DNA sequence: GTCCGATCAACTGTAGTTAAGCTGGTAAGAGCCTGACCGAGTAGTGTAGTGGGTGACCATACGCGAAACTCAGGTGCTGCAATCT
């Protein structure tokens, strides 16, 4: 309680080890459920009214030391990296309904989403930044999912061990949804991994986004 | 250590005891070589035990391949509805 910070309202065990990310799935029609992932790999959704009577599991991942999880409030779905190399959506009231959104050759390290639109931004540690419409997956039929949903690479960082440049590539690439795909882990230059990515969420700024690599090359674009 | 000089016998003048080998027929020393009898010497042997290394058989390990099982791709009609007519 930010007004009474001396003692917590509750202190209950929910994971075996380090809890990496916690996220709130707010709604005008359902309880404020909370999701959590940890180095033990479990993804749990629960209601803070009573954890013990409500705790539910979405998945167990391989133990991974950075797992981005965010809430897409336009479609009431959590958006998460599987700790390896796929982006997936899970509705807060149907945990079994896991839909994979995109596959990448290197781990998804940062994810961003906004309160005004369903556009999800995901950055992989290969320096690739991808955009995809999560609502097109969530609000439509299962049958033609392998062809009706696609993604676009907005930018790619690259680096040369001998030339020492950072080499931002503006060229757009379309990646279709490989549903049955393998997890992958291609190692890449230390500075070119994407450390954060977020859209501005005001109406005036709503087409603007910001992203960063780990060397320091913060980058912003207005999508017009 | 040495000094005097008495004194058994050293080294000095002639008067009287010792072999060697002849005639032999002979038994006496000093002896030789084969043989036998036990003690000791040369030395490989007779049980008996400690250690080691060889051989067989196993299972444990990874790594590549083989088939298993799960979960979701893909085929094709037609119940039902909508575009063109």
Task: Please provide a written account of the structure.
This protein is mainly β and 224 residues long. The protein is built from three helices and 16 strands. The protein has a five-stranded antiparallel sheet. Strands 1-2-3-4 form a four-stranded antiparallel sheet, with no helix packed on it. Strand 2 and strand 3 form a beta hairpin. The radius of gyration is 18 Å and the shape is globular. The structure holds one DNA strand of 85 nucleotides. The PDB classes it as transcription/dna. Keywords: transcription factor, transcription, TRANSCRIPTION-DNA complex. TFIIIA-TFIIIC-Brf1-TBP complex bound to 5S rRNA gene. The protein is Transcription factor tau 91 kDa subunit.
Task: Compile the SSE list and pairings.
Layout: E1 19-25, E2 33-38, E3 42-46, H1 51-54, E4 56-60, E5 69-72, E6 77-81, E7 86-91, E8 99-103, E9 108-112, E10 119-124, E11 128-133, H2 135-138, H3 145-148, E12 150-156, E13 173-176, E14 194-199, E15 208-213, E16 219-222
Antiparallel strand pairs: 1-2, 2-3, 3-4, 5-6, 6-7, 7-8, 9-10, 10-11, 11-12, 12-13, 14-15, 15-16
The structure holds one DNA strand of 85 nucleotides.
What would you say about this model in short?
The protein has helices at 51-54, 135-138, 145-148, and strands at 19-25, 33-38, 42-46, 56-60, 69-72, 77-81, 86-91, 99-103, 108-112, 119-124, 128-133, 150-156, 173-176, 194-199, 208-213, 219-222. It is mainly beta and 224 residues long. It is globular, with a radius of gyration of 18 Å.
């Amino acid at each position: 309680d930010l007004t009474d910070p001396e003692v917590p309202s509750f202190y209950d065990q929910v994971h075996d080890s380090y809890i990496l990310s916690v996220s709130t799935a707010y709604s005008d029609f359902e309880d404020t459920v909370v999701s959590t992932v940890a180095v033990d790999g479990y993804f749990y959704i629960f209601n803070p009214k009573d954890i013990a009577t409500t705790k539910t599991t979405v998945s167990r991942f391989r133990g991974s030391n950075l797992v981005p999880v965010v809430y897409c409030p336009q479609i009431y779905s959590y958006i998460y990296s599987d700790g390896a190399s796929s982006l997936r959506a899970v509705p807060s009231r149907a945990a079994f309904a896991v839909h994979p959104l995109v596959s990448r050759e290197t781990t998804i390290t940062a994810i961003g989403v906004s309160r005004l639109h369903p556009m999800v931004l995901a950055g992989s540690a290969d320096g690739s930044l991808i955009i995809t419409n999560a609502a097109r997956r969530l609000l439509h039929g299962i049958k033609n999912s392998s062809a009706t949903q696609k993604s676009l690479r907005l930018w790619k960082w690259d680096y040369s061990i001998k030339d020492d440049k950072y080499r931002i590539d503006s060229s757009y690439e379309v990646y279709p949804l490989t549903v049955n795909d393998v997890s992958k882990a291609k190692i890449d230059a230390h500075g070119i991994n994407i450390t954060c990515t977020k859209w501005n969420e005001t109406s005036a700024g709503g087409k603007c986004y910001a992203f960063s690599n780990s060397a320091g090359l913060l980058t912003l674009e207005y999508l017009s």
